[PDB]
Design a protein around this nucleic acid. Structure first.
Length: 159
RNA sequence: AAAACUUUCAACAACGGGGUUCUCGCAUCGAUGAAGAACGCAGCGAAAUGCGAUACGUAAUGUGAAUUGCAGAAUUCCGUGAAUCAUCGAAUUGCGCCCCUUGGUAUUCCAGGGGGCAUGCCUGUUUGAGCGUCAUUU
């Protein structure tokens, strides 16, 4: 219940409260790595809500991006990559969008190592990633190119 | 896997916020449609032409079966009558009458062509009518 309240305050109206909640959640993960999966699940529980609101999901994606991953946490990384892709399809389906895509690409790049997902999953979004590379915000195109390079290398596409 | 987050600048992007009345001066009117307005007008039209809210028009006169891209009226058609018809002096498309001349089986009926005729009033010419009055054996 305490975690529910704390992660609920990610979607607060005031950006200061959301930032404080994100910082405290990241501190909580560091203090107790074992609850990292529970914290990530709780954050996912809000970001995917039908009434999530752009502020809440944006700060939640930031918090998920700033999580730390180890080479034995494939389940957590496999959770995070799928969550990022689901959110990406949710919002793709502009300036506010560009920042959220930047953060989502950052998260997918962070979690693409440590993630044992079939390459075919990324192949579905590959064209979409290229659509980002010519986007208005170059900060998104950098991360899109990073993701494209990583997927191409691991999947051994023609490149 | 070096970025995020807060704050302040800075851009860039959203979001955002003719009438009516009063006063002043000037003096110039036309039955031939002024100045000004505007739907653009035709049953359905763009230009051309025509017109003015009576708006491809209204009235009057003439002609006589159309208009036409489509639709639709019809003209009781043997005529009081269409026509984006004509003339034009001011849908009423109102209400009419008769004469002259030729033909088609022609005494009936029909078809052409031409010509007048609205009414009222004044003057004068002509023609008649009245049991109105009257003369009428040089």
């Amino acid at each position: 219940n305490l975690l529910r309240l704390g992660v609920n305050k990610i979607g607060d109206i005031d950006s200061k409260v959301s930032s404080k909640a994100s910082y405290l959640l990241l501190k909580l993960e560091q203090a107790h790595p074992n609850m990292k999966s529970i914290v990530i699940d709780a954050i996912v529980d809000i970001a995917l809500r039908p009434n999530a609101d752009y502020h809440t999901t944006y700060y939640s994606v930031i918090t998920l991006n700033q999580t730390i991953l180890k080479r034995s946490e494939d389940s957590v990384a496999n959770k995070l990559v799928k969550t990022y892709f689901t959110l990406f399809e949710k919002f793709l389906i502009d300036e506010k969008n560009s920042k959220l895509f930047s953060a989502l690409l950052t998260g997918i790049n962070r979690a693409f190592p440590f993630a044992q997902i079939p390459a075919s999953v990324y192949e579905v979004h590959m064209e979409t990633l290229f659509k980002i590379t010519h986007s208005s915000n170059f900060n998104t195109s950098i991360q899109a190119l990073v993701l494209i390079n990583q997927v191409t290398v691991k999947a051994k596409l023609n490149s």
